Amino acid sequence: YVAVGQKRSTVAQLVQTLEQHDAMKYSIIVAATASEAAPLQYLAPFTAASIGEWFRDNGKHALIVYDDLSKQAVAYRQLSLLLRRPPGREAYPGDVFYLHSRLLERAAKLSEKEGSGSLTALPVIETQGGDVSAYIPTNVISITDGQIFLEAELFYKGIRPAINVGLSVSRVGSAAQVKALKQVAGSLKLFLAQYREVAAFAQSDLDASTKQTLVRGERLTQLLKQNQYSPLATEEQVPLIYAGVNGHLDGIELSRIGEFESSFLSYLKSNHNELLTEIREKGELSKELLASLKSATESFVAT
Amino acid sequence: GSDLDASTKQTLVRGERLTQLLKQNQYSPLATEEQVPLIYAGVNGHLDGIELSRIGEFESSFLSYLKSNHNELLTEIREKGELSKELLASLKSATESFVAT
Amino acid sequence: YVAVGQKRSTVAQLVQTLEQHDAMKYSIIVAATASEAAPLQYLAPFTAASIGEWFRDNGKHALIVYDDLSKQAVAYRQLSLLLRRPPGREAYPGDVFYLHSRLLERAAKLSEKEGSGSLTALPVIETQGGDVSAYIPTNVISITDGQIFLEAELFYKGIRPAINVGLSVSRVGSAAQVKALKQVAGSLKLFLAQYREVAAFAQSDLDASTKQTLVRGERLTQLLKQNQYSPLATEEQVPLIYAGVNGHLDGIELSRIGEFESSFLSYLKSNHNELLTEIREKGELSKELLASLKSATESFVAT
Amino acid sequence: ISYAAYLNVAAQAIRSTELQTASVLNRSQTDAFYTQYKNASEPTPITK
Amino acid sequence: ATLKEVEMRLKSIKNIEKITKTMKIVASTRLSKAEKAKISAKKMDEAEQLFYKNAETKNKELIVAITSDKGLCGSIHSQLAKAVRRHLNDQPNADIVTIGDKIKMQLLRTHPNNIKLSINGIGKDAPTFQESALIADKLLSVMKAGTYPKISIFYNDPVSSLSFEPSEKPIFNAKTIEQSPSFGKFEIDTDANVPRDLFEYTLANQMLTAMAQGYAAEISARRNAMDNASKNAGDMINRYSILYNRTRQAVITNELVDIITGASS
Amino acid sequence: AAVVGQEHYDVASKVQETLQTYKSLQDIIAILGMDELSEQDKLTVERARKIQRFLSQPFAVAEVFTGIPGKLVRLKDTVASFKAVLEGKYDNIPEHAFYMVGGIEDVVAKAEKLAA
Amino acid sequence: AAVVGQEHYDVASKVQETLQTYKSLQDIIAILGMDELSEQDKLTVERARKIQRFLSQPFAVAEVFTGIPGKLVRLKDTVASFKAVLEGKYDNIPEHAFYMVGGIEDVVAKAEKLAA
Amino acid sequence: AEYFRDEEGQDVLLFIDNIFRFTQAGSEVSALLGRIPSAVGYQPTLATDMGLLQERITTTKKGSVTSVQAVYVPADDLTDPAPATTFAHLDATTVLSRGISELGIYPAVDPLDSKSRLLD
Amino acid sequence: KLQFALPHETLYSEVTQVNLPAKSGRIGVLANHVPTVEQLLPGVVEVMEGSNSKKFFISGGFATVQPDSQLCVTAIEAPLESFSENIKNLLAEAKKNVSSSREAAEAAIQVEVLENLQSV
C-alpha cells in the first residue's frame, strides 16, 4: 500500500487497522506522508514499484495499490515549476503523461518463460469535482485498463461500498473471474441494467413489468451493501448471489435482506457446509451443485 | 404551474405589498420617524387588502395623514427611538384609521 | 480559386472536376495545401490577391474565392506563436484583425475613372459548429458586407444549398441585381421571413390566416431547393420565381413542386422561348412581358 | 331523500358476503368537499 | 462562473427532461385505465339515451361544467373555459356549476355572479358513480335542478386520442319528460313518480358519463402535452450542451493565457 | 421624470416591466406550451409580444435595403403611441400588424390592410 | 458504528438517508408535486422538514445575532431525541415547533407555545 | 507502407491506433521543445504535422496506401480542436456501436451513423 | 334482446325471460312485452336465457323495455353468488344508527338492504 500524501496520523490509523485485521503478515507500507518532501513524493510510486519487482521477478504475486497518484501528480508539478521546466495543461508538467504511463505499465502478469508471477496494481485517482475531463484523470483513464467509479451520491444514499457500477468498467474483467461466480452472474448484470433504466419510473402508478424489475433491483441493491472492513469468503459470495438470481430474495422484504444474508450463511454452514466446501474446492458449479443449492435456498427462504 | 393554496397566497398577497412599500425614487431620502409607521402598517398586514396599484398612493397619503394628526406621534419617535406601549397603540389606532380613507 | 489548408488529393479532384466542366480556360487555381508550410499558407492569400489585382487593373471584372481564411487564421496563429508574439483571444494573434482586413479590403469595383475593374471577393469561412460568436468568424463578418450562412440541419434535410435566411444578409447585393429578378423576386425574402415567423409558433395555437401563409411558405421552401453542380439560367429563374411570388404554388401541391419546376421550364421553352429571350434582353418585365408571363404561368399551371 | 341518492346509498351498502375488489370499494368511497359558491362568495367546503 | 452557471442550468434541463419523460410514460399507463372505463360508461349511458331518443324529449338555464382539478392536463381547462364564455354569450344570466378547479377559476373571474355551486376533489381520482350521484343529489338540493327548464353540461369529448374538443350536451328536464311527444308509447303508472325519479336518475347517469369522457380527455391531453414537453426540453438540452462544451474549452484557454503570461515574465 | 416628464417616465416604467416579465417567462414558454402560461400572465405576454413587434420602425437608409419605406415618428407622437398600447386600446389586432410599422395610427391603417 | 457505537450510528444513518430522500424528491415536488408521489414518501418529506428544523437550535453567542439562547444538549440525549423523531413519535408536533429550539423537551414546549 | 506502395506497387491498408494519442504525443513534444501551447493545449504545429501524416497517405499511380485510423474523441467532445483537425483529414467515418452488437449484428458497424463522403 | 348494464361493466348489453323487481311489484319480461319504463327497486334479479339462468343481485336503477323490444336494464352495481352474515352484523349497527337519526334515510335504506339480504 503506497500511502501518498496521507497524513502521518492517517497512516497511523492504517497501521493500527492492518495490525488489527492481522494483515501486516503480508503487507508492506511504503509511506510518503503529507509533509514528506516533494522529491520523495515524486519518486514514491517509483520506489514502491521496485519493491514489487522483486516479488514479481521471483515469480511471486503481489498487489501494489497506489493511493493516490493524484497527489503524486501535484508533487511533480511542484518540481517542474520550481525547476522552471516548461509548464503545461492545468499547470501540470508537459511530460506528466509520460511519467504516469511509465509507472502504470510496470504492473504485469509475467510470461510463462519467466515463470508465472504478477504485480497486480490498483491506482487510486481523486476526482476534484467529479471532473473526469480533468487533465490528470483523463490521462490516467486512457492509460488504465478498467475503472471503478465511486460516486458520493451513493455513499450518502447509504450504499456503502458506493461504487457506481455503471461507470465501472473492466478490461480483462470476466476472463479472470471465478468460473463458478461467472456462471451465476450473467443474469445479475442484466438485472441491474434494467433496474437502472426503470429507476426513474419509481417516482407512481407502476406497470407490472416495471414493478417486477423494481422488486428484483431493490433487493439486489440492498444485497450489494456490505459493512466496511468486512470481506466475504468467495465460497460464500457465490451462494448469496445464487439466491438473488433465483429470485427467492424477492419475497424477502427489504429490511429482512440483511438478516437473510447472515442467516442464510449460518443455514448454509449448518445444513450444507458440504456445499460450501464443494464450492470452495470444486470451484466450478455443476448441475448437481446448483440443484442442491437451489433446494437449500428454498428451505432457508421458507424460514 | 403550481396551483397555490390560500394559505400560501396569504403570504404572497402580504409579500407583494411589502415590495411596493420599499420602492423609493432616486434622490428622495425619507425621515426614519416616518419610515417606522410605513413598516408598522405593512408588517401588521393593514396593506395586504389594499389594492396593489394604489399602495403608492396609500404611502403618500398615509404620510400626509400622519403629518396632519399624529405629528405629536412623529415627534415622540424622533425623541425616544424605541416604540413604547403608548406609541404602539397610537400607531395601531392611526394605521387602522387610515386603512379605509 | 485560392485553396488554403486543403489536401493535395482533394485539390487534385477539384482540378480534375474543373477540367471536366472545362472551366480551366476561365479560371486560375492558386494552391497552398495542408502539406505546404505554414508561412507559405500565411502568405498564400496575399500573393493570390496580387494576381487578381492585375486582372482588376486590366479593368476587367473577376472573382477570387478564398477558401478558407479560417485555415489562414491557424497559419498566422502558428507563425505568430512561433514568433513568440503573446497570444490573443482564442489563441489567434492580436494582429489577426489587421491580417484579415489587409487581405479583404484589396478587392472592390474600381471607379470608372480608374477603370471598370472589379475583384469580387467571397471568402469562405469554415465555422465549426456554426459558431457565429467565434472570434475568427465575427471578425470576418464585421469586415465583409454580406454573409451567406448555411445551416447544417437544413443541409441534412436536403436544402442544398441550405440558406439560413435569418443569418444571411447582403448589404448592397440588391442594387446589383438585374431588374427582372428584382421585380419577380420582390419581397419574397420578406415573405419567407414570414414563413420563418409563422412556423415559429406553428410548432401555442394556429389560425387559418397563419396557416395560409404556412402553406405558401412551406411550398415556397420546396421551390428553393436545388441539386448541386447543376446551374440555372437567369432567364429560367425569372419565371419560376414569378410563379411562386404570384402564389401559383398553392396551385401546385407541395409534393409536385419539384415536378412543376422542370415541367414548367420545358413548357416555357416549347410554348414560347420568345418570352424568355425578351426578358433576357430587356432585363426587366414590361407590362407586356409581365402579362405574357402571367398568361404563360397560368397556362402551364392549368396543364 | 332524492331517488337517485336513495339508489346510491343502497349501492354503497350492497358492496358489503364480501369478496370485493378495491376498485369497487374506491367506487363506494367519496373523496370530495363541495364548495358552495355564493353570488363570487362561497359558503363552507362541506364534505360531500 | 460561466462554466458552473451553464452546468447547473444544464443539469436542471436534464432533470426536467427526465421528469417529462417519466410523466409521459406514466400518463400512458394511466391512459389505459381511463379509456377502459370510458367504454363501460359510454355503453351504460347509451341505454338511457335509447329512451330519450324514442321519447324525442328535446331538452332559467343551468350550466354545469367538468374539468380537471389540477394542471399539466394540457389545454383542456382553457379550451373549455373559452367555450363556456362563448355559450355564456348564449345566455347572459345562467348559473354555472363548476365541477373542477381548473374550469372554476377561469369562469369565476369572468362572471362573479354565475358561480353558484362548485365541487372540489373529483378530478384526482378517476370518475366514480358515488361522486357523480352525490353531486347530482347536491344539485337537486342546493340548486333545485328540476326547476331549470334548460340544463346543459360541459366536458371535453376526446374526439381522437391525439385531440380533445370541448363539448357540451343538453341534460333533459323533468318538465320536458312529461310532455315529450312520446312518453305514452312507454307505459307506466298514473301514480308514477317517473318524472321526479327518471330525471334524477339520468341527472347522475348522464353526469357520470360526461365525467368519464372528461377524465379520459384530461389523461389523453396530458399524454400529448408531456410528449411535446419532452421534445422542447430536448432542444434546450442541446442548446445548453453546446454552450457548456464551448465554455469548457474557453476556461482552458483563459487559464492557458494566464500561464503563458506568467511564463513570459 | 424631471427630464422627459413624469408621463414619459411612467410610460417607460410600464414598458420595462412588461418586457422584463416577458423575458422572465421565456423558460416556461419553451418548456411547456404558451397556453400553459397563467391567464393573467398570458395577457401580459400577448401585450409584450405586441410591444416587441411594435418597436420595429422602418428606417430611411434601411428603406433601400429592407425595401420597406422609412418611418420617422415624432417624439410627441411616440409617447402617445406607446401610451395607447399600454392602455390596450389597439391591443386587439395581430402581432403581424405591429411588425415593422411606424406610429400607432399607421398600425390601425395596417390593420385595415392586413384585414384585406 | 464502533467509535460512537451501533446505536448512535444507526440513528444517524437513518437521518442521513431521510434527508437525502427529501433532497432527491425536491425536484419531483417541483414539477410533479404531491400526486404520483407516495403517501409514505410524503410522510418522509414531512419528517425531513421537521428534522431539518430540529437541527435548527439557537446559539448562545447569537443572542445578539438572534435573541433565543442556545442549548447545549447532551450528546446521548440528542441521539435519543432524534431517534424519537425517526420513529414518528412526534409527528403530531408542528414543523415550526422543531425550528430554532433545543431538545425534545423544548420542541414539545414550543409545540404547546405555538398551539396557544 | 510507402516501400510497399511505391516500390512493390502494392495496395496496402495501414491501421493506426488512437490518433488522439498521435495528437497528444505531438502536443507533448512541442511543450518539451518549449513552444507556446495553443488552444486546448494543442501544439502550434498541430495542423501541419497531421497534414504530413495524412498527405503521405495517398493513392499513387504505382499502388495505393489506404488508412484506417482510430479516433477516440477526447472528453467525449467532438468540439475539441484535436477532433476538428482529425475530421478534416477523414474521408469516411465508420461508427462501430455496441448497441448494434447487442442486436446481434456482427459486424457491429452502426448503419445510420456510418456515412462517407465517398458515397455519391 | 336484453341490455343489462352497470357503469362498472356491461352484463348483457336472445335472453328469453328476465324477472325484475320494480315499484310496480315484480315484472317479468318474456318475448314481446309492451314497452314500459319501471323504477328498479333494490332487487334480486333473475335472468334466464334459454333454460340457463343467471342470478343477479341489483342495487336498483331503471328498467325500460324499448319499443324495439330491447330491455334496457341499467343499475348502479350488481351476480347473486358474488353477494353471497357480516353484513347482518353491520345492519344491526345500522339499527343503532336509526336512534340518532340524511343519516335517517341511510339507516332506513340499510333496513331495506337487510330485507334485500334476507331474501338471499
Provide structural commentary.
The structure is cut from a larger assembly and holds three copies of chain A, one copy of chain D (48 residues), one copy of chain E (265 residues), three copies of chain F and one copy of chain I (120 residues). With 303 residues, chain A is mostly helical. Chain A has helices spanning 8-20, 38-57, 69-82, 96-104, 135-143, 152-156, 179-183, 186-197, 208-223, 234-245, 256-282, 287-302; strands spanning 2-4, 30-32, 63-64, 66-67, 120-121, 146-150, 163-170. In chain A, the strands form three sheets. In chain A, strands 2-1-4 form a three-stranded parallel β-sheet. A two-stranded parallel ribbon of chain A has the order 3-5. Chain A has a two-stranded antiparallel sheet with strand order 6-7. In chain A, helix 1 (8-20) links the parallel strand 1 (2-4) and strand 2 (30-32). In chain A, helix 4 runs parallel beside helix 5 (135-143), helix 10 crosses helix 11 (256-282) and helix 11 (256-282) runs antiparallel to helix 12 (287-302). Chain D has 48 residues and is of the alpha+beta class. By secondary structure, chain E is α/β, with parallel strands linked by helices. Chain E folds into two domains: 1-25 and 226-265, ATP synthase, gamma subunit, helix hairpin domain (Helix Hairpins, Orthogonal Bundle), CATH 1.10.287.80; 26-225, Pyruvate Kinase, Chain: A, domain 1, CATH 3.40.1380. Chain E has a five-stranded mixed β-sheet, with helices on both faces. Helix content of chain F is 65%, strand content 0%. The longest helix of chain F has 20 residues, at 5-24. Chain F has helices at residues 5-24, 26-31, 39-54, 62-66, 75-86, 95-98, 104-115. Chain F has 116 residues and is an all-alpha fold. Chains D and E meet through helix 1 and strand 1 of D and strand 3, helix 4 and helix 6 of E. Strand 1 (33-36) of chain D pairs antiparallel with strand 3 (115-118) of chain E, so a sheet runs across the interface. Chain H: F-type ATPases have 2 components, CF(1) - the catalytic core - and CF(0) - the membrane proton channel. CF(1) has five subunits: alpha(3), beta(3), gamma(1), delta(1), epsilon(1). CF(0) has three main subunits: a, b and c.
